């Protein structure tokens, strides 16, 4: 009982469609959304529209087709004036809005039953993780730890690298020096320091965002980074924490949101999802199967000889359940 359906683009809405596809192929999210549909609050909010849409997809007669998500898009425009337009937008910006917006709807719902210390929604149970930022002042050598939550990780990207290496230097100890000296409270002055962000609590789904942009301080404009950045089908992630219990979680690539275009001001968004062993591409209404080798090999770019450079932007890594 599998449903592979395209989504109509109502004028530069690919940034939106592509995220919905990736989110639909993140089963804990899809299952949770479908479950929310069932209760039927019947007060039009972005979450109810999403669930109504995901419900059409899941409860369709034919296994393959096309759905115009008019209803949802209407609500998205009503709910956000920055998305209430025919301009092209960022997929990550949409994802962030959608995920927090639907977490905030649930946060209120959780509170209204208590009506008649904070609580974590099912959006957080799926995508949330925790970091620990350790800061060692190099003069007094006092270390300052600080936990900070995350819904995705915005990793820096380098030419001819891998998603693993980028995650490796994201967690590497950087030196805060010169103009970037740390203000040490015990030293009461600015001193050189070591800054390290390590994973404290692992997310069920690791959402990876690639910082594929370079600002040209002099040229007063930013470019799109179409580097060859390879992503593995599996990811080994290990845990820091209490050290009373240790985790060595193995992740799997479920979806890739990819941005086609040489520049960052205009483009086209598509999604490639892994469903039942084989991979498939979703270009709005068009849904077609793709061979595993042609997936990663086309989401990078060698030299410049690759028309309108399709590059991997958002990556969905699912824990091994």
């Amino acid at each position: 009982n599998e449903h592979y359906f395209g989504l109509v683009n109502f004028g530069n809405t690919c940034y939106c469609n592509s995220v919905l596809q990736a989110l639909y192929f993140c089963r804990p999210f899809r299952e949770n959304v479908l479950a929310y549909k069932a209760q039927q609050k019947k007060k039009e909010n972005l979450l109810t529209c999403l669930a109504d849409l995901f419900h059409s997809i899941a409860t369709q007669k034919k296994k393959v087709g096309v759905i115009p998500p008019k209803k949802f898009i209407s609500r998205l425009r009503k709910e956000n004036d920055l998305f209430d337009n025919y301009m092209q937008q960022d997929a990550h910006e949409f994802l962030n809005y959608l995920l927090n917006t639907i977490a905030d709807i649930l946060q209120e719902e959780k509170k209204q039953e208590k009506q008649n210390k904070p609580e974590l929604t099912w959006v957080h149970e799926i995508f949330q993780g925790t970091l620990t930022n350790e800061t060692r002042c190099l003069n007094c050598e006092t270390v300052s730890s600080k936990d900070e939550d995350f819904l995705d990780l915005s990793v820096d990207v380098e030419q001819n690298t891998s998603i693993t290496h980028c995650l490796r230097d994201f967690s590497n100890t950087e030196t805060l020096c010169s103009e970037q000296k740390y203000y040490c409270e015990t030293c009461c002055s600015k001193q050189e320091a070591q800054k390290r962000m390590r994973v404290k609590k692992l997310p069920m789904i690791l959402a990876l965002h690639l910082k594929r942009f370079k600002y040209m301080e002099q040229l007063h404009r930013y470019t799109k980074l179409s580097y060859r950045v390879v992503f593995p089908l599996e990811l080994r992630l290990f845990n820091t924490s209490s050290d009373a219990v240790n985790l060595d979680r193995m992740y799997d690539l479920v979806a890739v949101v990819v941005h086609c275009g040489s520049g960052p001001n205009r483009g086209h968004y598509i999604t490639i999802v892994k469903s039942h062993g084989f991979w498939l591409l979703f270009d709005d209404d068009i849904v077609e199967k793709i061979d595993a080798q042609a997936i990663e090999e086309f989401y990078g770019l060698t030299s410049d000889i690759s028309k309108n450079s399709e590059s991997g932007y958002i990556l969905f890594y699912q824990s091994r359940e």
């Binding site: 600080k146 939550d149 995350f150 910082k211 205009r266």
Partner: protein
């Protein structure tokens, strides 16, 4: 109070903020160090993209907090 920003290259920069400081004012402080116009900037913290109108105190952003600086990749 001093907070950190993880720049587009992963380089961390420090900022001398106040909890009272607006998100648009944080962006201006980043513009001085990085050169990026605020209109182009996007800051993620605690999995939440910070809204221009709000202040750091609103988002509970305290000393040693790391804001993730990120840009747009417009697609149709």
């Amino acid at each position: 109070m001093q907070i950190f920003v993880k720049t587009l290259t992963g380089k961390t920069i420090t900022l001398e903020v106040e909890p009272s400081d607006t998100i648009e004012n944080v962006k201006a402080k980043i513009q001085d160090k990085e050169g990026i116009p605020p209109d182009q900037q996007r800051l993620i913290f605690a999995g939440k993209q910070l809204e221009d109108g709000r202040t750091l105190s609103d988002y509970n952003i305290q000393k040693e907090s790391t804001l993730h600086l990120v840009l747009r990749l417009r697609g149709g």
